[PDB]
Structure formats: structure tokens, C-alpha cells
Amino acid sequence: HKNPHIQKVAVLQSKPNKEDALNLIKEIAHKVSYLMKENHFKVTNLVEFYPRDQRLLGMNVNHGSKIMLRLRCSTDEFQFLPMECIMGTMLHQLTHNLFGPHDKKFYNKLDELIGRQWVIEQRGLY
Ligand SMILES: [Zn+2]
Numbered sequence: 097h098k099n100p101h102i103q104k105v106a107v108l109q110s111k112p113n114k115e116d117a118l119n120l121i122k123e124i125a126h127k128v129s130y131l132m133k134e135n136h137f138k139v140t141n142l143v144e145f146y147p148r149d150q151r152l153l154g155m156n157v158n159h160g161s162k163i164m165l166r167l168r169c170s171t172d173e174f175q176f177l178p179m180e181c182i183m184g185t186m187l188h189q190l191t192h193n194l195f196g197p198h199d200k201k202f203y204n205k206l207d208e209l210i211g212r213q214w215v216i217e218q219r220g221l222y
Pocket residue numbers: 188192198
């Protein structure tokens with residue numbers, strides 16, 4: 097459906113094939129809808145970014161106020177990253193709605209979310 101736990105999704109308007117980028121990030125928002133419901137996650141803005149720092153794949157501002165995702169390869173703005181890779185980044189950043197540091201609480205929760213998201217996808221819950 098349309099994920100009610102994410103208020104707004106946006107992509108970079110100056111990048112090429114921004115229609116495909118918007119479809120991609122909308123797909124991310126859609127796929128995680130049931131997981132966010134189960135976990136009471138809310139995200140105000142889910143947006144694309146493309147930082148010059150190529151190490152940066154995602155970021156979570158203020159525990160869910162904004163999650164930024166890299167959608168495009170750092171070396172080639174025309175090539176989008178694999179959906180599987182972006183989903184991994186999304187689950188990692190959703191865990192930061194609860195846990196800031198990359199400590200045991202963080203990795204424990206991320207392990208639970210990865211497992212549950214796979215089950216949800218297999219069964220088609222939403
Ligand atoms: Zn992190």
C-alpha cells in the first residue's frame with residue numbers, strides 16, 4: 097500500500113532519471129511498512145542524498161526525524177545501487193531510531209530486524 101509511518105519521501109531533483117530514483121525510494125518505503133508497524137517506528141522524512149564522502153551510505157538525523165539514503169553509486173551517478181543493498185542500509189538506519197552507538201544493543205536489534213523483514217517479505221504481510 098502506502099506506508100503510513102513515513103510522512104514524506106523525496107529524491108534529489110537535479111540528478112538524472114529522478115523518476116526511477118523516486119520509484120526506488122518509494123519501493124523501499126513500501127517494503128518496510130509492516131516492520132515499522134510492528135516496531136512502532138516512525139520516520140518523518142525519507143530522502144535521497146549523494147554525499148561527496150563515498151563511505152556514507154545512509155544517515156539517521158534525530159532518531160527518525162530524517163533518514164537519508166544513498167541511491168546512486170558514488171562513482172557513477174547514473175547507476176543505482178542494488179535494491180538489496182539499499183534495504184540493508186534502511187534497516188541499519190531504522191535501528192538508529194532506538195540505538196545511537198554501534199554497540200551490542202544496536203547489533204542485536206538489527207539482527208532481529210533483518211530476520212523479521214525477510215519473513216515479512218516471504219509471507220507478504222503489510
Ligand atoms: Zn549506523
